[PDB]
Design an enzyme around this catalytic site. Structure first.
Site, PDB file in Angstrom:
ATOM      1  N   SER A  93      51.609  50.275  50.520  1.00 26.32           N
ATOM      2  CA  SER A  93      52.510  49.785  49.441  1.00 26.32           C
ATOM      3  C   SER A  93      52.497  50.397  48.070  1.00 26.32           C
ATOM      4  CB  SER A  93      52.480  48.269  49.404  1.00 26.32           C
ATOM      5  OG  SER A  93      53.412  47.795  50.489  1.00 26.32           O
TER       6      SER A  93
ATOM      7  N   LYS B  53      50.148  48.041  41.293  1.00 29.44           N
ATOM      8  CA  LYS B  53      50.760  47.999  42.429  1.00 29.44           C
ATOM      9  C   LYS B  53      49.548  48.168  43.717  1.00 29.44           C
ATOM     10  CE  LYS B  53      53.778  47.102  45.318  1.00 29.44           C
ATOM     11  NZ  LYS B  53      52.450  46.560  46.256  1.00 29.44           N
ATOM     12  N   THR B  54      49.509  47.250  44.626  1.00 29.57           N
ATOM     13  CA  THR B  54      48.683  47.401  45.666  1.00 29.57           C
ATOM     14  C   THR B  54      49.222  47.997  46.913  1.00 29.57           C
ATOM     15  OG1 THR B  54      49.450  45.209  46.032  1.00 29.57           O
ATOM     16  CG2 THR B  54      47.633  44.857  44.810  1.00 29.57           C
ATOM     17  N   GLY B  55      48.182  48.396  47.820  1.00 29.85           N
ATOM     18  CA  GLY B  55      48.501  48.653  49.004  1.00 29.85           C
ATOM     19  C   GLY B  55      47.452  48.231  50.005  1.00 29.85           C
TER      20      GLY B  55
END
Length: 269
Positions: free
Chosen positions: A47, A211-213
């Protein structure tokens, strides 16, 4: 701050603990200096691509003002995976801006797919990345298929350095007008999916927009702007991790430890 050579040895030891590949790029805008570990190797984005997606939509709105308040229609058939915001709003739809906020703040998968539709697809997002000087980003699939993270597969990958430099251009630079840059940073500051990642490894007084993923092969990523103090020069930090078997567990502790090295390199106690 901690000498870059000692930061390197500490990042190597963290990678040993991970039992996998650690990718890190940090850029201190105060002095333009960097810290790098596997910063030119490819990692599955998961993501983290959604930050570039939001940027592309904001860039489209700079060209055609008004886009952000236009309403997108969709039905529940389009819902995929973790879609906590879009699953509430199919009857009346959502504005483009509300979809961007859901994609960034909550990682809403369907919101991301609807924004990809608005942009005309993964290749169009990849073209946008190329226009902001990123030669490594590539989006190939839509949600929820882009998270397979198979080692060596180039689909849906970037490098830590490419992502860090793209985040600089989008969140701090002129890829967007000042109003859009400010909005992107507001969405990043509103991310609620990354408390246990970079945020946990920096001093209490620092403000983080991230922002993570997360994906298969134990992939756990976090990409952030760090603001040490009001007015001080920000720092870009892109952290990617990948592990060695398909069902490996994510290692948030590795991200925290790597962020703490970066903070020490910047001068934190």
């Amino acid at each position: 701050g901690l000498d870059a050579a000692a930061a390197a040895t500490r990042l190597a030891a963290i990678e040993t603990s991970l039992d996998g590949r650690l990718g890190l790029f940090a850029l201190n805008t105060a002095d333009g200096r960097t810290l790098a570990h596997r910063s030119d190797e490819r990692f599955a984005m998961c993501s983290t691509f959604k930050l570039v997606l939001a940027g592309a939509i904001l860039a489209q709105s700079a060209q055609t003002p008004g886009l952000l308040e236009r309403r997108v229609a969709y039905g529940p058939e389009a819902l995929v995976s973790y879609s906590p915001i879009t699953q509430k709003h199919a009857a009346g739809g959502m504005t483009v801006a509300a979809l961007c906020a859901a994609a960034v703040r909550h990682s809403d998968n369907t919101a991301a797919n609807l924004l990809l539709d608005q942009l005309d697809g993964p290749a169009a997002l990849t073209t946008f990345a190329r226009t902001i000087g990123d030669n490594h980003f590539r989006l190939d699939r839509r949600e929820p298929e882009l998270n397979t993270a198979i080692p060596g597969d180039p689909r849906d990958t970037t490098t830590p350095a490419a992502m860090g430099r793209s985040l600089q251009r989008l969140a701090l630079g002129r890829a967007l007008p000042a109003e859009g840059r400010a909005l992107l940073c507001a969405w990043l500051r509103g991310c609620v999916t990354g408390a246990a990642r970079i945020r946990a490894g920096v001093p209490a007084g620092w403000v983080v927009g991230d922002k993570t993923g997360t994906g298969a092969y134990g992939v756990a990523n976090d990409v952030a702007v760090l603001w040490p103090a009001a007015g001080a020069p920000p720092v870009l930090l892109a952290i990617y991790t990948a592990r060695r078997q398909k069902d490996a567990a994510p290692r948030n502790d590795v991200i925290v430890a790597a962020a703490k090295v970066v903070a020490e390199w910047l001068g934190a106690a």
